[PDB]
Amino acid sequence: SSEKLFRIQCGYQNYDWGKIGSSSAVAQFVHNSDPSITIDETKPYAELWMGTHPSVPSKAIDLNNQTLRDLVTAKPQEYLGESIITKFGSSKELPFLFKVLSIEKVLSIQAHPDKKLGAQLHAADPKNYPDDNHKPEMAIAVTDFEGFCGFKPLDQLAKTLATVPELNEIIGQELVDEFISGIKLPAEVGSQDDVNNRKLLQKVFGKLMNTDDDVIKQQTAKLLERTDREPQVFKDIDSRLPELIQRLNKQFPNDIGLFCGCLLLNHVGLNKGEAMFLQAKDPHAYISGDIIECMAASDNVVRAGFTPKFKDVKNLVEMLTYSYESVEKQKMPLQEFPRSKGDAVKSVLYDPPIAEFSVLQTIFDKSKGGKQVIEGLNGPSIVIATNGKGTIQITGDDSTKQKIDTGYVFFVAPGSSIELTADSANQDQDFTTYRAFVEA
Ligand SMILES: NNC(=O)[C@@H](O)[C@H](O)[C@H](O)COP(=O)(O)O
Ligand SMILES: [Zn+2]
């Protein structure tokens, strides 16, 4: 039992939107790692939490089952290092939380606070806002993924406002006119034209979000009818849109998210391996797929639709920046990672412009196999295997060699060089790992 490289058994969340039972990647990974856990086949397994966030612990199975949070707290210098202790301001915890999500139904229409709102929300309602942190995040598609992310460009929103009768009726023609006349493009971010564009978009969004629920139920029914009788109205906005509306209405009948997500937010698809980042306060809602997520350590979320959980429409309306930048600006270029070398066919850094984390992906071909060696990184890491199997060890110390099968999660102490090996008695699954880490 090395304290440098060691297995962790991570807790999970059974949120409603999760894939059910053994069809969930969360359930699969949990059970794989600890075959003694009985998967409840009737239950959703939505999120695997890998981290030191107090809401869900990770336990070091060969270090007397103590929690990762406790182990950090007992030895901050060894587990975090002074650079991470100083930059992020804690001796107790990781500044990131790393997750697997396995999504069956769309998540809440949601936004996470920045630092200022984080502190204010936590102070005003610590029950619903359980810490004071911000939560920028990143998603990496493990299977093909869809989600909502950011307000659509203004010309698309103007078109939608003019051509979708059920939305136009909720907003009212005077406000639709005010919005469509008033917007000015191009507008540089920060310019008075931009400021005014955002104020107009906030007026439209607030009018929608504060509409009486019985009105929303009446208009959603008519919207749904219209996707059937006049699909082309919807396809002219975006070709996937009538089917989207139909599919989400089956999940959450007559939900306000049919207006506020489907009509106002970009519908993003990510192919497997593609990724996107979300700065704090970007509005979003993940629709489908299995993903890796990494975020600043927080569970603050303001929700406003597609959920039975706590909704706070007024905070949502007030906090959003109302940016309408193209969503392509937050799809990430994949980068090379010099500090890893070997036989892996993919070795890919996902490093968004967010201080609290990066993620390194490693993939070995099923037939080719081989070994990859990664230098010690200047901060704590979590590694998960999402596919295939192999072995993991501290480089040059064969006594630390351990099996790493699908779903196994390991902590790696700062400075510790790692060597991965693909299983060789095997030629059918590409051994694949994701490692979340941070460096000042
Ligand atoms: N974008 N994804 C996330 O922020 C997830 O990590 C959080 O856990 C979300 O809060 C999950 O969505 P619900 O609150 O259950 O609607
Ligand atoms: Zn989120």
UniProtKB/Swiss-Prot annotation:
GO terms for cellular component: cytosol. It is found in: Cytoplasm. It holds the Pfam family PMI_typeI_cat. Pathway: Nucleotide-sugar biosynthesis; GDP-alpha-D-mannose biosynthesis; alpha-D-mannose 1-phosphate from D-fructose 6-phosphate: step 1/2. Binds 1 zinc ion per subunit. GO terms for molecular function: mannose-6-phosphate isomerase activity; zinc ion binding. Gene3D superfamilies: Jelly Rolls, Phosphomannose Isomerase, domain 2. The keyword Cell division does not apply. Keywords: Cytoplasm, Isomerase, Metal-binding, Zinc. It comes from the Eukaryota. The keyword Isomerase applies. Zn(2+) binds at Q110, H112, E137, H284. It catalyses: D-mannose 6-phosphate = D-fructose 6-phosphate. InterPro entries: Man6P_Isoase-1 (IPR001250), Mannose-6-P_Isomerase (IPR016305), Pmannose_isomerase-type1_CS (IPR018050), PMI_typeI_C (IPR046456), PMI_typeI_cat (IPR046457), PMI_typeI_hel (IPR046458), RmlC-like_jellyroll (IPR014710), RmlC_Cupin_sf (IPR011051). PROSITE patterns: PMI_I_1, PMI_I_2. Monomer. PANTHER family: MANNOSE-6-PHOSPHATE ISOMERASE. Involved in the synthesis of the GDP-mannose and dolichol-phosphate-mannose required for a number of critical mannosyl transfer reactions. This is Mannose-6-phosphate isomerase. It comes from Candida albicans (strain SC5314 / ATCC MYA-2876) (Yeast). The gene is PMI1.
